[PDB]
Amino acid sequence: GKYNLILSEYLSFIYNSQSAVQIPIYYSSNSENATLLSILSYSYDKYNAVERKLVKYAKGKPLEADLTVNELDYENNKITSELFPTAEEYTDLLMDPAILTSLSSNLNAVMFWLEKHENDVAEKLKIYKRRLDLFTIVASTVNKYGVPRHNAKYRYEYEVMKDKPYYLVTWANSSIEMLMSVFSHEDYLIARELIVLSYSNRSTLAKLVSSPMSILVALVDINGTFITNEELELEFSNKYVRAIVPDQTFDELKQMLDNMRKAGLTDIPKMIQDWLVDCSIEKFPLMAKIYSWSFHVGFRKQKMLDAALDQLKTEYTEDVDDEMYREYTMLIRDEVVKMLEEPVKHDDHLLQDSELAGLLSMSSASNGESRQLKFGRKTIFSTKKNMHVMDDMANGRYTPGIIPPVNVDKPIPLGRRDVPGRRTRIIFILPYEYFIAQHAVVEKMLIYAKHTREYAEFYSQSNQLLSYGDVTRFLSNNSMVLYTDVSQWDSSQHNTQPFRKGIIMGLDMLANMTNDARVIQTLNLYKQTQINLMDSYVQIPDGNVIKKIQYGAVASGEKQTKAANSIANLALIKTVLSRISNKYSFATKIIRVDGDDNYAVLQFNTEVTKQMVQDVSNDVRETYARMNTKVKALVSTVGIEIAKRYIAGGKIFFRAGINLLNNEKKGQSTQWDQAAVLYSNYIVNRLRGFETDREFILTKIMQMTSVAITGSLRLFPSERVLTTNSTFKVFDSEDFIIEYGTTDDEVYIQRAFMSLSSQKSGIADEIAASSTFKNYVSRLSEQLLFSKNNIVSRGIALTEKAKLNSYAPISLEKRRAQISALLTMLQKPVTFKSSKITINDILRDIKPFFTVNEAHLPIQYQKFMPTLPDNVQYIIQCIGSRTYQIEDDGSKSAISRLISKYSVYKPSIEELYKVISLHENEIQLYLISLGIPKIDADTYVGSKIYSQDKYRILESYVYNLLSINYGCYQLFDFNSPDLEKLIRIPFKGKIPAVTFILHLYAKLEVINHAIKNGSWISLFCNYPKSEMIKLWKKMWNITSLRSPYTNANFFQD
């Protein structure tokens, strides 16, 4: 236990007074060698805690802000009284960190670290002397204007920020995030320029540093690559491809290094300067270090008019060539007929009721407008769209046929989504009837995209070498890759008229291919959303006035914007590659589009020279410019930039910009949930090359998970509360290892968190008894089936109860009751007694039968991701990277091929697991509640194919429990021939459920032993026949511990 040692040492630092006492609370598994639950703390003298210890670190000179480096007047670091004159006009939304942790908490987490490492040995001393020279700059600037005391909900009022500079809080937050990631001398020279210059230059610093990364991935030679097959399976190929670069790229890379010297950066353009002499892959992680560090400057929060002015003001002309727009509109028309040819001819059940298909899946839509609703006696304000339907279905206003206009009378409100170092993107806020019309038709466009080679939904898995590995499979010395960066994709001229009229023309060739009266109707309503968006006005508020701007283009926030933007690229890059073939003769190997970032691999006849690269790039940005789409045409021979991934020289490099101590939107979480987002943003940045200290993170989990009931008492939970596998998990003991503990007091506490895993909310039980909720449930049972049954109607009325957990105040009355019920268990050490099978109860019976021995494995495979940590790179080089991805979606089964066809619901794999192990007449009672007819659910039960479907659901459910497809286990090959020489388990037939879990648990204990220690072990399990039958009856009653904030911990982006 190491977190318990830092927890006791922290409270002896922040409470320096004599009146502070700490009472540890212990507990045991027996009645009468004990692990501790929490640590009490009574401290009374608490005024001026941080402002007294800051003065001993405030030396040197403070930073004087430069006031003539930004174009706008409210982006400079001026005094707030000089910027906002009165307290009535004070906008917090330009500097708000939007995290529930104040600046006075972040300064104690550094001053606690600087005391523990004040007198270390000569290797760890140089890290301390580099993190002290940076903290002198941060402390002496804050101490001049003082420390701003936060609000009760962690905002900053006007009266505490009156005499300070405006961005003092949101600069001291990001600079503490940067100085706690300095490890080498190269990391100290980057952090000094991004701390000094970031005090004045709040506009164009993250753009100048992160600019030359699209160029530098085209200079590094390839010597050995990973490729992928036609089906997505990995291969290793060791060709040699030379990098060819024209003389105008180096005349552009020299321009990017002289823009970085006008801004004042004088030691970041010396590392790129000294790397270009070699152009080597062995020094390239220095060039991705500078690209990853540039995103930690901070967010560019601006006014909504001032950030949507260059986007909404474009020059549309009629001096384009109209001969090129006829082929562009025809190629969009040919795709929509090609996508909906099979679900319209054979009339699918999903298109026949598009009104019901959007109603039962409106929890996937974006948040709409803020509207006043009335649910019985209560009056609530909500932006979720399925709450707008329950108010509109009661008052006699629910008309899904009539689609409202978005012209000058009723404009479209606008929301933003921004990323540091890029421009901002606007998001439409559409009514709730643009989601119902565009859901059953777009879902038929995204099943064709999962079987077509040129789209992005084909190469969409959990791994990252199998998805973006088709870039380098066509690479040779006679080919070139052509990745182009369209600047303003949203409002270009090729998107307003010919894109909406290419879809409308494609839905008129599908109104003559069918014979039902319903499929003509759902293809007419999807056509009606395109004529109304042909002339759309947008609404942007500024000051007193509200501006209405005409905007006939395509923005995000729609439903079709992920599958119809991919059609407009494959029709536009097919027209440009046909105009460039009048000067050259090639053969297009692959085209692959993902939104608005794409590539295309052209294979030439003769060898590629330096003249065929400079003159193809001048025929891409001159053919695009004939269609009024200005682009930055880039061609390369070795490496590209596919979407946020940088494949340079055979290796794949990611970006590591995730802001830990800042956020872009004010989230609706608690502190306990944002202490697991802060940890899971540290594991992501550690795997990509931005290593923050662990002891700064573990200090930040101490200051966020603690909760007080009185102003003098504090409760700090221990390691065994936060690390155990339950609802309340925050972090793990070792970093990349998910451990399931097996001790008689560790299963005793995991069952003790099973009582208060389900709490009730006082808001959702008053909505569910109101009259307008019963009117919404009653009119869904009419459309779902023509009959009336009492079983299906309670099965519907208790399904929209869980849909109200997406509402933000309802999902906060549960979580505020989780932590307030935990405090009665951390104070009273005795708990309750119950029995319920978890995953740890199964592993209690398997672990005493494994015998370990020492073993060795020589390295045989090489590394394709060179920014991974050292203990994970020993696993990959010894057992191999993943070759093929095993699916856990369950759609290969025969019950998930029946639910998806005959109904619109989607049941969770934790729901299909519980019902597949019951009798025949219990699967019947469940399948009718899904919407399946009685004659179909009598077929599947009466066919006895559920007996052979028991093992296709348990295979995909155990892979979800142990998190094999997600986490950091999605890199190692599990069917490798080098893990089977270590696992030696004799085979005993006729029980497949137990033999499967003996080989999946033995494969994890060998991997989790070689990350902790770096040495391999071999296992042997002579499991008896009398213990296999006892474990066989517990493989079906296993229950999982699901949490809402943990479902985001499975994916990276």
Binding site: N544, V545, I546, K547, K548, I549, Q550
Partner: peptide
């Protein structure tokens, strides 16, 4: 009050 910008 509204200002039309077309």
């Amino acid at each position: 009050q509204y200002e039309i910008l077309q």
